[PDB]
């Protein structure tokens, strides 16, 4: 369309922390990473603006021009809410109507076609669902993704209840995107990411028993944390390659990772927003994950 582009059927849209002072133009990241799709993170409640803002108080509209320029090369974005720290819009809003108004302001500012709810903290899932019923009614072209903590012993944790609530309420669930990271008791590697994927497959089959195997895999995305994780385990470049190959074979809907600005070498094991604590060259993980899209027709 004139102000929005198609996202491929099998896509890779890694997270960019928009609040970092190192932030490059989106078009520059496209050139460097090889992907022209990104998940922009995170919108939170700003007390200063009494509404949505990046990391809870950078002006909402700051990146409109960057998104326009990315769209000029055929790129597109997913706008993400939430993340590790609150206050989330869905926590601060007193009513689902207020919450939907805020989500719609974000959609309208960016002409967004896809939203991501990265729900890590405790929330009122009923209020969220009620808000999203309003959003999908008013903005019926906007897809919803849910990015949620996971563990290779269980699949989704409390986030399972969120998806259950969505499905019951009749809220569209376009993507379920477990965060395959930070288990603490077992390492963040490809084997464990695949176990999470399999568990989530079973979880979604329970909610949507009428869906085919291929329909369920299409709903699933996986998001590792590249290189060193918060628990000192390391999701390696070999893990990336193994996961990409598995993802291609299973024809899953999407991959992402935390994060674009971490895709640089750094001192071994150091946790940073600016590098991944491994020795792989700049953009090495990005280039491996792009192979997922390339299997299914993508070229850039
Ligand atoms: Mg929120």
Tell me how the structure was determined.
X-ray
Residue spans of the domains in the chain: they are 1-300
Q: How far is the CA of 118 from the centre of ligand 1 (A)?
A: 8
Q: How far is the CA of 86 from the centre of ligand 1 (A)?
A: 9
- Edge-to-edge strand ranges of the sheet holding 11-12: 11-12, 254-255, 221-222
Q: How far is the CA of 71 from the centre of ligand 1 (A)?
A: 25
Phi, psi of 121 (to 5 degrees): -95, 165
Q: How far is the CA of 184 from the centre of ligand 1 (A)?
A: 26
Q: How far is the CA of 53 from the centre of ligand 1 (A)?
A: 11
Q: How far is the CA of 140 from the centre of ligand 1 (A)?
A: 19
| Cβ–Cβ < 8 Å for 212, 168 | no
| Cβ–Cβ < 8 Å for 10, 254 | yes
The two beta strands, 11-12 and 254-255, are parallel
Residues with CB under 5 A from ligand 1 (ion): 81, 88-90
Q: How far is the CA of 214 from the centre of ligand 1 (A)?
A: 29
Q: How far is the CA of 253 from the centre of ligand 1 (A)?
A: 23
Give Cα 219 to chain centroid, integer Å: 13
CA dist 10 → 154, 215, 234 (Å)? 25, 13, 26
Q: How far is the CA of 254 from the centre of ligand 1 (A)?
A: 22
3.40.50.150, 1.10.357.10, 3.20.20.80, 3.40.462.10: which CATH number matches 1-300?
Answer: 3.20.20.80
Question: What tokens does 177 get?
Answer: 């995107």
The two beta strands, 37-46 and 51-54, are antiparallel
Give Cα 195 to chain centroid, integer Å: 19
Task: Give resolution in angstroms.
Answer: 1.8
């Amino acid at each position: 369309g004139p102000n929005a582009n198609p996202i491929p059927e099998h896509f890779f849209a890694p997270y960019i922390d928009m609040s970092l002072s190192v932030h490059k133009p989106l078009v520059e990241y496209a050139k460097l990473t090889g992907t022209k799709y990104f998940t922009l993170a995170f919108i939170l409640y700003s007390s200063v603006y009494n509404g949505p803002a990046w990391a809870g108080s950078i002006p909402l509209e700051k990146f409109v021009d960057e998104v326009r320029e990315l769209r000029e090369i055929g790129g597109e974005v997913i706008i993400a809410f939430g993340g590790a720290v609150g206050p989330y819009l869905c926590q601060q809003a007193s009513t689902p109507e207020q919450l939907a108004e805020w989500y719609i302001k974000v959609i309208d500012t960016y002409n967004a076609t896809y939203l991501d709810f990265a729900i890590e903290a405790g929330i009122d899932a009923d209020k969220l669902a009620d808000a999203l019923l309003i959003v999908q009614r008013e903005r019926p072209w906007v897809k919803f993704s849910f990015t949620l903590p996971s563990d290779p012993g269980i699949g989704l944790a409390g986030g399972y209840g969120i998806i259950e609530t969505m499905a019951k309420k009749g809220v569209r669930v376009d993507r379920v995107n477990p965060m395959t990271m930070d288990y603490y008791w077992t390492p963040s590697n490809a084997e464990n990411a695949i176990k999470v994927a399999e568990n989530v497959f079973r979880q979604l089959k329970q909610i949507y028993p009428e869906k085919s195997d291929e329909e369920i895999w299409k709903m699933i995305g996986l998001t590792p944390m590249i290189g060193v994780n918060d628990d000192k385990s390391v999701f390696t470049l070999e893990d990336a390659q193994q996961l990409v190959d598995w993802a291609i074979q299973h024809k899953i809907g999407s991959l992402a990772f935390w994060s674009v600005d971490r895709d640089h070498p750094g001192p071994t094991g150091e946790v940073s927003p600016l590098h991944r604590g491994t020795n792989d060259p700049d953009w090495a993980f990005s280039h491996v994950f792009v192979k997922f899209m390339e299997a299914f027709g993508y070229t850039f």
